[PDB]
Design a protein around this ligand. Sequence first.
Ligand SMILES: O=C(NC1CCNCC1)c1n[nH]cc1NC(=O)c1c(F)cccc1F
Length: 274
Amino acid sequence: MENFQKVEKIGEGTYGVVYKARNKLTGEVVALKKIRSTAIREISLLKELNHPNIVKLLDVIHTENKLYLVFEFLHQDLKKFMDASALTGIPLPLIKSYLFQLLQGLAFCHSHRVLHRDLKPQNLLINTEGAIKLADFGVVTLWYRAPEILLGCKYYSTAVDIWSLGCIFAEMVTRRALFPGDSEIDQLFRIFRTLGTPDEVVWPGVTSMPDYKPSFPKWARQDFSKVVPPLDEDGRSLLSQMLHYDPNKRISAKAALAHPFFQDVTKPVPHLRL
Ligand SMILES: O=C(NC1CCNCC1)c1n[nH]cc1NC(=O)c1c(F)cccc1F
């Protein structure tokens, strides 16, 4: 650890604190995450999970009851970029590029049986080159939580990452969070109010979930044309498939990459003021 000079705190978190730091020897600038035997083994599995859309884990330093994760440094995250593009909105071809890249990242993880589990704009990092990458592989924000997690499914699938990414896609488009819940039930009920209270028709097995209550109010569903205007039909079609209640019907990352929405995908560069 002494092998690094701290430059500035870049953020806190549930797990640990994140610093911008400099390798005292190499000069390399990195993000250094400080963590307050099976965790060590799953961490070391992460070191092999290399992809251009996954923040590169450079090193894992286990010392004196402290754990340091050394990551490649990126200058900006999607949360701040959204905030900064608020007045004008992220241009659609850039939204589409970011979505496509994240779908590639997810198709990679998922094929290796790795789930992210906690996707959110704050953990999506961006560079000047137009690249976007997944970070922080798993108050706590519930806004991107899939409904099967909220309903108490213990053994949820890669589908939960697709739900979170749908939520982020919608938010880039509208410049407002899709389901800004401030408690588990508020999060659940905000989802129901927009997508309709789920039942056995749309999600077989739903009424048998651990936290499902027959007393849930019964809201009718709303049309996507109301949800994410002025996203085109291809985009609204893809979003509706990323937000299917049933995790088994929800589109996979790999099938999403084939959706017609991406027929004209390109890689624009964002304008970033560092
Ligand atoms: O936070 C990072 N960069 C910020 C720099 C300041 N401008 C904003 C971007 C970062 N660069 N490389 C990895 C990073 N962060 C993480 O891996 C990370 C995270 F994104 C969220 C939680 C924990 C964590 F370790």
